[PDB]
């Protein structure tokens, strides 16, 4: 059982996460230009509120390299609710099994950083 290599982007507003073409891949100096491609997957947790009924928390969007993670089998551009795709110029459309996912027992998450000039929808924040 594994985890995203990066911390999540929390959705504070009504808009799903979306990036303009060529944007959205997190910075990771340990990966190469061919690897800069993947998807974000929405994870929506539920909690028992103060009243006593269940409710959704803010959705969290986690990045996974193409061909890894909970949707490792999906090809780039696959239509699936809660999955959005991103790729940098120069990336290769091949599975990134060599990067894989993170084992939290032996690796901390990488703080998710987006390069300068990256635009986001309302309610998401870039570090
Ligand atoms: Cl947050």
Numbering used by the authors: 48 to 174
From the article:
The N-NTD possesses a peculiar, hand-like three-dimensional fold, with a β-sheet palm and several flexible loops, arranged as fingers around the central β-sheet. The latter, together with the extraordinarily long basic β-hairpin finger, constitutes the positively charged primary RNA-binding surface.
All crystal structures of nat_mutants with WT-like RNA-binding (nat_mutants P67S, A119S, E136D and P151S) superimpose well with the NTD WT with RMSD values between 0.592 and 1.776 Å. Mutated residues in the above-named nat_mutants lie peripheral to the structural core, which further supports both the converging structures and the unaltered apparent RNA-binding affinities.
